[PDB]
Amino acid sequence: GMRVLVVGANGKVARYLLSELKNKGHEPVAMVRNEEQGPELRERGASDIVVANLEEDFSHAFASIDAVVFAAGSGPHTGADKTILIDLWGAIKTIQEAEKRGIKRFIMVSSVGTVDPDQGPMNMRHYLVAKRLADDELKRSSLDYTIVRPGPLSNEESTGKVTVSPHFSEITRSITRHDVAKVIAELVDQQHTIGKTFEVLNGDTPIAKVVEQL
Amino acid sequence: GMRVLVVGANGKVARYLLSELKNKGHEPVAMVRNEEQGPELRERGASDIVVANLEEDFSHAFASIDAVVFAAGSGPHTGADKTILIDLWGAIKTIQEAEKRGIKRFIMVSSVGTVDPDQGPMNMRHYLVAKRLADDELKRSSLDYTIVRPGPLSNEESTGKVTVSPHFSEITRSITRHDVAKVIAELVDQQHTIGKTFEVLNGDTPIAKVVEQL
Ligand SMILES: NC(=O)c1ccc[n+]([C@@H]2O[C@H](COP(=O)([O-])OP(=O)(O)OC[C@H]3O[C@@H](n4cnc5c(N)ncnc54)[C@H](OP(=O)(O)O)[C@@H]3O)[C@@H](O)[C@H]2O)c1
Ligand SMILES: NC(=O)c1ccc[n+]([C@@H]2O[C@H](COP(=O)([O-])OP(=O)(O)OC[C@H]3O[C@@H](n4cnc5c(N)ncnc54)[C@H](OP(=O)(O)O)[C@@H]3O)[C@@H](O)[C@H]2O)c1
Ligand SMILES: [Cl-]
Ligand SMILES: [Cl-]
């Protein structure tokens, strides 16, 4: 059972992820910007709460941690300034802090669209570049990484069933946030998933079996 | 005499740079987004004009080129989306295109503030990260690079006199855009400046002598 720091722990995927990690026998440590978000994240599955901000010194957050999941993001309501500062620069600093501390296991929540950002919708291209460049920083690191690139996210209830590819030639489906969380929790302690980058949609294959074959 | 592609050739520094390169015996090739900008850049010193856009396929621009100067930028009037897409992603693609083609000589026009972007003014921090990460991409490349980090830019007339440092412990001065252009033109064909990153302010030392000692 790993102590897993969830960076971005108040987000929609992350919230589900706290519960998925708990029920896999892990100890989810939720990182939050303000202390008042903590009580409900404990109800959702967090073992511990750490109050830290990616824009400030957040090194204290990484104390006694076995694995990091980067699930943070600025979102569609803050500017492209925050896409740079959170999704890209924040991720880069989380990676450096994990190396510094010797935390080997790192799961990146990325996105489809990142293999070829210049072919993505112009209105999204800045986001896709930010995600891509963060992925590349992880790929250049010494960490035991896995990069999960979900398709378009939905808020439907979990199906428990997905499809994966190193890279789909087209994206014609969505994935529920519940199911992304399930995928991450399934692979956090799977050594055979180290060094893997994959895209994930809802589909027909049970999540446990998909992860077995990654 | 080198054929020097000036990326961002319609900008304020770049415009002066066309003339500085010409009068050093180089052939400045101005890259512009639209053809109508070309006639005046020829008057300012350009030997040739190439019409290309960093957001589209611009590989044709790099034909018959000996050196690249990246002097492009989104500016304070477009969004942080364009800081990502031009200053960072555009630079990254220019670097890749230079490697692809075997163009060895690359001069980056960067900025002070990049050694420690989190200590810079919050309103500028996204820009400083973009510049920093572009600099790091160049530093990881196989190119014969020089990175010039000017201080705050001014539109005063050239003094011809500067101060340099690997990194100033404080910035209490500006530098004219004329003088930045002079610095770049001075070092483009100087082999001893390869692998050098430095900050540059106006000061007391003639530009030729500063470059001799880099
Ligand atoms: N939308 C899509 O269709 C789509 C597609 C592919 C990939 N994705 C990616 O999937 C990820 C997870 O999705 P999601 O729906 O869970 O996103 P979300 O609900 O926006 O989660 C983002 C979290 O990041 C946190 N955060 C923001 N700034 C922070 C900072 N400075 N320090 C620490 N935390 C900070 C937020 O905190 P607060 O609670 O304080 O706001 C929020 O809880 C996204 O981040 C996105 O990049 C999305
Ligand atoms: N302001 C400061 O105090 C300061 C301090 C330190 C460093 N700097 C850096 O110094 C650099 C040079 O300064 P400057 O004053 O010459 O800037 P500038 O006048 O804004 O020059 C930027 C140029 O980039 C071009 N450009 C924009 N998008 C492009 C694209 N997609 N493809 C090709 N070209 C594109 C613009 O073209 P158009 O002519 O079509 O607009 C413009 O000519 C800046 O880029 C900045 O990063 C500035
Ligand atoms: Cl793609
Ligand atoms: Cl600095």
XYZ file of C-alpha atoms and ligand atoms in Angstrom:
526
model
C 0.000 0.000 0.000
C 1.563 3.244 -1.290
C 1.262 6.770 0.055
C 0.112 8.542 -3.086
C 0.212 12.331 -3.273
C -2.675 13.541 -5.475
C -1.662 16.981 -6.836
C -4.840 18.744 -7.922
C -6.839 16.690 -5.397
C -9.953 18.958 -5.394
C -10.491 18.452 -9.146
C -13.218 16.231 -10.614
C -10.990 13.307 -11.675
C -8.871 13.618 -8.494
C -11.829 13.442 -6.235
C -12.907 10.086 -7.725
C -9.256 9.026 -7.664
C -9.079 9.459 -3.846
C -11.747 6.797 -3.457
C -10.291 4.489 -6.103
C -6.849 4.587 -4.452
C -8.287 3.989 -1.002
C -10.223 0.959 -2.145
C -7.066 -0.456 -3.788
C -5.352 -0.313 -0.332
C -3.334 2.862 -0.933
C -3.105 5.914 1.267
C -4.230 8.933 -0.759
C -2.720 12.234 0.367
C -4.752 15.126 -1.014
C -2.936 18.349 -1.862
C -5.225 21.387 -1.629
C -4.778 25.168 -1.909
C -6.959 25.817 1.167
C -7.505 23.909 4.371
C -11.321 24.161 4.183
C -11.357 21.746 1.191
C -9.834 19.013 3.378
C -12.745 17.661 5.459
C -14.769 16.650 2.353
C -11.732 15.120 0.636
C -11.192 12.992 3.745
C -14.887 11.871 3.350
C -14.121 11.014 -0.318
C -11.147 8.823 0.626
C -8.095 10.928 1.569
C -5.858 9.578 4.337
C -4.152 12.940 4.884
C -4.426 16.495 3.612
C -1.553 18.762 2.759
C -2.103 22.468 2.141
C 0.214 23.647 -0.656
C 0.045 25.673 -3.869
C 1.915 24.928 -7.148
C 2.683 28.658 -7.493
C 4.422 28.825 -4.098
C 6.943 26.611 -2.280
C 5.134 23.262 -2.060
C 8.092 20.969 -1.201
C 6.638 20.100 2.245
C 3.820 18.285 0.358
C 6.213 15.546 -0.832
C 7.206 14.334 2.656
C 6.679 10.595 3.255
C 5.327 9.950 -0.276
C 5.777 6.766 -2.412
C 4.005 7.907 -5.658
C 2.809 11.189 -7.175
C -0.210 11.631 -9.435
C -0.250 14.981 -11.267
C -3.978 15.664 -11.733
C -3.838 19.519 -11.555
C -4.954 22.000 -14.160
C -5.894 25.655 -14.445
C -9.286 24.863 -16.119
C -11.306 26.706 -18.836
C -12.184 29.698 -16.512
C -8.677 31.055 -15.705
C -6.440 32.519 -18.462
C -3.840 30.902 -20.700
C -1.415 32.466 -18.181
C -2.482 29.763 -15.713
C -2.243 26.984 -18.333
C 1.466 27.913 -18.578
C 1.933 28.342 -14.835
C -0.110 25.266 -13.615
C -0.414 22.647 -16.352
C 3.146 23.136 -17.655
C 5.392 24.916 -15.150
C 3.613 23.359 -12.118
C 4.084 19.871 -13.568
C 7.720 20.607 -14.313
C 8.319 21.663 -10.714
C 6.436 18.541 -9.382
C 8.721 16.350 -11.448
C 11.838 18.115 -10.170
C 10.613 17.806 -6.597
C 9.994 14.031 -7.071
C 13.548 13.573 -8.492
C 15.061 15.683 -5.707
C 13.312 13.518 -3.091
C 13.900 10.152 -4.791
C 10.146 9.430 -5.223
C 10.317 7.022 -8.173
C 6.670 6.545 -9.171
C 4.972 9.291 -11.155
C 1.605 9.203 -12.979
C 0.828 12.076 -15.340
C -2.789 12.858 -16.274
C -2.344 14.315 -19.691
C -4.666 14.493 -22.751
C -5.174 13.249 -26.317
C -4.264 15.997 -28.774
C -0.672 16.048 -27.525
C 1.021 13.896 -30.195
C 0.341 16.629 -32.774
C -0.859 19.875 -31.120
C -0.659 21.901 -34.358
C -3.400 19.719 -35.858
C -5.716 20.285 -32.857
C -8.418 22.979 -32.672
C -6.738 26.390 -32.652
C -8.763 27.487 -29.577
C -7.256 24.526 -27.597
C -3.766 24.469 -29.096
C -2.110 26.364 -26.223
C -3.467 23.789 -23.776
C -2.313 20.854 -25.936
C 1.220 22.312 -26.198
C 1.317 22.871 -22.419
C 0.350 19.188 -21.790
C 2.720 17.913 -24.450
C 5.722 19.813 -23.105
C 4.992 18.639 -19.560
C 4.827 15.072 -20.883
C 8.205 15.547 -22.565
C 9.790 16.809 -19.351
C 8.561 13.604 -17.608
C 9.829 11.452 -20.454
C 13.310 13.058 -20.098
C 13.275 12.517 -16.308
C 14.687 9.595 -14.339
C 11.237 8.726 -12.925
C 9.284 5.464 -13.175
C 6.529 7.201 -15.062
C 3.229 6.384 -16.723
C 1.440 8.980 -18.886
C -2.348 8.567 -19.263
C -3.869 10.602 -22.099
C -7.657 10.569 -21.734
C -9.989 11.555 -24.550
C -12.646 14.284 -24.082
C -13.888 13.997 -20.491
C -17.503 13.351 -19.542
C -19.466 13.315 -16.287
C -21.492 10.162 -17.005
C -21.370 7.298 -14.463
C -18.516 4.803 -14.790
C -18.868 1.993 -17.326
C -15.675 0.239 -16.029
C -14.742 -0.511 -19.673
C -12.162 1.247 -21.836
C -10.059 1.046 -25.035
C -6.362 1.996 -25.154
C -3.807 2.818 -27.902
C -0.328 4.316 -28.031
C -2.045 6.751 -30.314
C -5.496 6.585 -31.907
C -5.701 7.631 -35.567
C -9.028 9.201 -34.685
C -10.966 10.098 -31.526
C -14.712 9.398 -31.871
C -15.520 8.759 -28.218
C -15.293 10.271 -24.717
C -14.247 8.862 -21.364
C -15.946 9.386 -18.011
C -13.905 11.053 -15.278
C -14.820 8.081 -13.000
C -13.187 5.691 -15.432
C -10.011 7.806 -15.806
C -9.701 7.669 -12.027
C -10.185 3.854 -12.143
C -7.484 3.501 -14.792
C -4.961 5.535 -12.757
C -5.656 3.661 -9.505
C -5.403 0.325 -11.348
C -1.875 1.024 -12.641
C -0.198 2.987 -9.846
C 1.505 -0.086 -8.382
C 1.971 -1.937 -11.682
C 5.700 -2.133 -12.531
C 4.954 -3.347 -16.069
C 3.271 0.016 -16.793
C 6.505 1.966 -16.128
C 7.657 3.971 -19.193
C 4.240 3.674 -20.851
C 2.409 6.499 -22.575
C -1.115 5.677 -23.800
C -4.410 7.211 -24.849
C -7.649 5.994 -23.184
C -11.329 6.159 -24.249
C -14.462 4.397 -22.981
C -14.843 1.140 -24.892
C -15.472 -2.545 -24.289
C -12.600 -4.003 -22.332
C -12.660 -4.175 -18.535
C -10.102 -1.776 -16.970
C -8.197 -4.529 -15.028
C -7.660 -6.493 -18.253
C -6.572 -3.418 -20.250
C -3.944 -2.658 -17.578
C -2.726 -6.300 -17.570
C -1.936 -5.980 -21.262
C -0.301 -2.560 -21.231
C 29.360 36.511 -44.712
C 26.476 34.379 -43.381
C 22.904 34.116 -44.605
C 21.078 34.850 -41.371
C 17.370 34.101 -41.071
C 15.770 36.670 -38.729
C 12.603 35.045 -37.301
C 10.369 37.841 -36.046
C 11.962 40.237 -38.558
C 9.201 42.918 -38.378
C 9.745 43.419 -34.627
C 11.525 46.438 -33.129
C 14.820 44.709 -32.240
C 14.756 42.667 -35.485
C 14.346 45.680 -37.639
C 17.523 47.267 -36.215
C 19.183 43.854 -36.442
C 18.648 43.723 -40.249
C 20.804 46.816 -40.621
C 23.419 45.694 -38.102
C 23.846 42.338 -39.874
C 24.065 43.962 -43.286
C 26.764 46.350 -42.167
C 28.751 43.431 -40.684
C 28.775 41.825 -44.194
C 26.010 39.278 -43.570
C 22.963 38.601 -45.682
C 19.873 39.132 -43.524
C 16.836 37.117 -44.603
C 13.695 38.583 -43.060
C 10.859 36.220 -42.181
C 7.471 37.964 -42.236
C 3.832 36.871 -41.857
C 2.712 39.002 -44.830
C 4.382 39.964 -48.069
C 3.495 43.673 -47.734
C 5.976 44.028 -44.818
C 8.847 43.061 -47.142
C 9.609 46.223 -49.156
C 10.376 48.292 -46.011
C 12.459 45.509 -44.454
C 14.533 45.435 -47.645
C 15.026 49.254 -47.149
C 16.134 48.532 -43.540
C 18.761 46.006 -44.660
C 17.170 42.671 -45.648
C 18.777 40.782 -48.536
C 15.734 38.546 -49.041
C 12.233 38.171 -47.651
C 10.518 34.928 -46.834
C 6.797 34.820 -46.083
C 6.130 32.251 -43.338
C 4.223 31.974 -40.059
C 5.393 30.158 -36.875
C 1.862 28.756 -36.445
C 1.867 27.119 -39.894
C 4.408 25.069 -41.870
C 7.393 27.428 -42.126
C 10.120 24.931 -43.163
C 10.605 26.618 -46.578
C 11.984 29.644 -44.647
C 15.130 27.718 -43.630
C 16.365 27.054 -47.187
C 19.936 28.228 -47.881
C 20.471 29.560 -44.324
C 23.762 29.594 -42.305
C 22.456 31.046 -38.963
C 19.076 31.617 -37.304
C 18.213 34.447 -34.922
C 14.974 33.859 -32.988
C 13.687 37.399 -32.366
C 9.908 36.611 -32.430
C 7.370 37.207 -29.711
C 3.622 37.501 -29.280
C 3.888 40.926 -27.508
C 1.831 42.517 -24.663
C -1.350 42.944 -26.861
C -2.122 39.284 -27.754
C -3.084 36.746 -25.036
C -0.970 34.392 -22.945
C -2.192 31.815 -25.502
C 0.200 33.402 -28.011
C 3.072 33.559 -25.488
C 2.794 29.741 -25.351
C 2.314 29.323 -29.093
C 4.953 31.896 -30.332
C 7.581 32.558 -27.667
C 7.749 28.928 -26.481
C 6.285 26.489 -29.010
C 7.407 28.601 -32.021
C 10.975 28.686 -30.697
C 10.892 24.956 -30.063
C 9.823 24.297 -33.647
C 12.530 26.725 -35.006
C 15.151 24.784 -33.092
C 13.893 21.453 -34.429
C 13.859 22.822 -37.963
C 17.490 24.060 -37.582
C 18.594 20.594 -36.306
C 16.670 18.831 -39.079
C 18.411 21.001 -41.695
C 21.888 20.944 -40.121
C 21.980 24.751 -39.576
C 24.488 24.902 -36.708
C 24.377 28.545 -35.593
C 21.457 29.688 -33.465
C 21.041 32.963 -31.523
C 18.166 33.166 -29.049
C 16.818 36.567 -27.960
C 15.583 35.776 -24.518
C 15.126 37.938 -21.371
C 16.396 38.541 -17.829
C 13.933 37.100 -15.323
C 14.445 33.593 -16.700
C 16.948 32.209 -14.161
C 14.235 32.335 -11.477
C 10.775 33.015 -12.985
C 8.932 32.372 -9.696
C 10.671 35.397 -8.164
C 9.612 37.675 -11.060
C 6.496 39.883 -11.063
C 3.420 37.648 -11.040
C 1.884 39.550 -14.004
C 4.983 38.631 -16.127
C 5.684 35.157 -14.760
C 3.994 33.292 -17.631
C 6.211 35.142 -20.106
C 9.375 34.439 -18.080
C 8.547 30.703 -17.902
C 7.875 30.628 -21.664
C 11.315 32.227 -22.370
C 13.070 30.028 -19.838
C 11.657 26.790 -21.233
C 12.561 27.818 -24.783
C 16.094 28.547 -23.565
C 16.259 25.088 -21.994
C 15.167 23.410 -25.223
C 18.052 25.220 -27.018
C 20.490 24.251 -24.288
C 19.485 20.559 -24.721
C 19.873 20.803 -28.522
C 22.918 19.971 -30.630
C 23.138 23.559 -31.943
C 26.030 26.031 -31.722
C 23.922 28.391 -29.683
C 24.229 31.729 -27.929
C 21.448 32.982 -25.624
C 21.227 36.771 -25.122
C 19.069 37.836 -22.171
C 18.447 41.583 -22.398
C 17.185 43.626 -19.470
C 14.030 45.792 -19.757
C 13.972 47.174 -23.307
C 13.961 50.875 -24.143
C 13.546 52.914 -27.324
C 16.335 55.424 -26.629
C 19.083 55.870 -29.261
C 22.036 53.475 -29.115
C 24.836 54.222 -26.655
C 27.057 51.416 -28.122
C 28.086 50.512 -24.539
C 26.870 47.606 -22.419
C 27.541 45.471 -19.306
C 27.235 41.664 -19.293
C 26.958 38.923 -16.616
C 26.077 35.236 -16.568
C 23.471 36.443 -14.150
C 23.108 39.821 -12.438
C 22.177 39.732 -8.743
C 20.036 42.769 -9.454
C 18.709 44.622 -12.511
C 18.777 48.420 -12.051
C 19.137 49.437 -15.690
C 17.558 49.064 -19.149
C 19.000 48.376 -22.580
C 18.074 50.064 -25.851
C 16.678 47.853 -28.604
C 19.367 49.331 -30.937
C 22.086 48.054 -28.641
C 20.554 44.555 -28.319
C 20.604 44.389 -32.109
C 24.284 45.512 -32.092
C 25.185 42.830 -29.556
C 23.534 40.062 -31.618
C 25.144 41.166 -34.899
C 28.540 41.428 -33.170
C 28.495 37.795 -31.985
C 26.743 35.894 -34.778
C 30.005 34.785 -36.397
C 32.027 34.540 -33.175
C 32.883 30.875 -32.469
C 34.081 31.708 -28.945
C 30.510 32.771 -28.057
C 29.113 29.274 -28.779
C 27.445 27.703 -25.698
C 27.220 31.068 -23.927
C 24.190 32.337 -22.050
C 24.448 35.911 -20.724
C 22.418 38.862 -19.508
C 23.008 42.310 -21.091
C 22.261 45.874 -19.888
C 23.420 49.299 -21.094
C 26.633 50.170 -19.272
C 30.134 51.436 -19.964
C 31.985 48.916 -22.068
C 32.006 49.121 -25.864
C 30.019 46.241 -27.447
C 32.981 44.893 -29.541
C 35.124 44.600 -26.400
C 32.353 42.944 -24.351
C 31.952 40.308 -27.091
C 35.745 39.729 -27.256
C 35.698 38.783 -23.587
C 32.605 36.591 -23.573
N -11.885 18.751 -20.071
C -11.513 17.749 -20.885
O -12.281 17.250 -21.728
C -10.130 17.157 -20.725
C -9.648 16.327 -21.739
C -8.402 15.741 -21.595
C -7.667 15.997 -20.449
N -8.117 16.804 -19.468
C -7.240 16.995 -18.271
O -7.691 16.178 -17.176
C -7.358 16.826 -15.948
C -8.292 16.410 -14.826
O -9.603 16.835 -15.178
P -10.599 17.445 -14.078
O -11.875 17.529 -14.871
O -10.414 16.750 -12.748
O -10.084 18.981 -13.867
P -10.468 20.024 -12.665
O -11.791 19.583 -12.078
O -10.327 21.435 -13.246
O -9.240 19.844 -11.626
C -8.136 20.762 -11.525
C -7.659 20.973 -10.089
O -6.420 21.700 -10.165
C -6.350 22.477 -8.974
N -5.391 23.610 -9.016
C -5.484 24.711 -9.777
N -4.448 25.524 -9.491
C -3.706 24.913 -8.545
C -2.534 25.251 -7.860
N -1.909 26.418 -8.121
N -2.028 24.427 -6.913
C -2.645 23.276 -6.645
N -3.778 22.915 -7.283
C -4.321 23.715 -8.239
C -7.777 23.010 -8.771
O -7.964 23.490 -7.417
P -9.313 24.225 -6.851
O -10.223 23.121 -6.382
O -8.802 25.078 -5.693
O -9.856 24.955 -8.061
C -8.604 21.803 -9.183
O -9.028 21.117 -7.991
C -7.449 18.320 -16.225
O -6.583 19.015 -15.316
C -7.140 18.438 -17.721
O -5.847 18.938 -17.981
C -9.336 17.385 -19.581
N 9.613 44.405 -23.654
C 10.693 44.185 -22.885
O 11.085 45.000 -22.030
C 11.504 42.928 -23.114
C 12.440 42.563 -22.144
C 13.222 41.440 -22.351
C 13.053 40.708 -23.514
N 12.147 41.044 -24.453
C 12.062 40.184 -25.675
O 12.751 40.802 -26.777
C 12.124 40.401 -27.996
C 12.336 41.426 -29.096
O 11.708 42.634 -28.683
P 10.898 43.545 -29.727
O 10.629 44.763 -28.885
O 11.565 43.522 -31.084
O 9.465 42.783 -29.910
P 8.328 43.020 -31.064
O 8.518 44.416 -31.616
O 6.984 42.623 -30.445
O 8.676 41.873 -32.152
C 7.955 40.632 -32.265
C 7.776 40.171 -33.710
O 7.272 38.824 -33.657
C 6.475 38.660 -34.826
N 5.523 37.521 -34.784
C 4.450 37.401 -33.986
N 3.814 36.252 -34.285
C 4.507 35.654 -35.276
C 4.348 34.463 -35.993
N 3.314 33.640 -35.719
N 5.210 34.134 -36.982
C 6.230 34.947 -37.262
N 6.417 36.104 -36.595
C 5.573 36.474 -35.596
C 5.701 39.981 -34.960
O 5.148 40.124 -36.291
P 4.175 41.346 -36.784
O 5.090 42.445 -37.253
O 3.379 40.733 -37.933
O 3.408 41.719 -35.533
C 6.765 40.988 -34.555
O 7.326 41.559 -35.751
C 10.648 40.228 -27.670
O 10.076 39.284 -28.588
C 10.638 39.858 -26.183
O 10.374 38.490 -25.955
C 11.372 42.142 -24.278
Cl -2.714 14.305 -32.046
Cl 15.980 35.761 -12.164
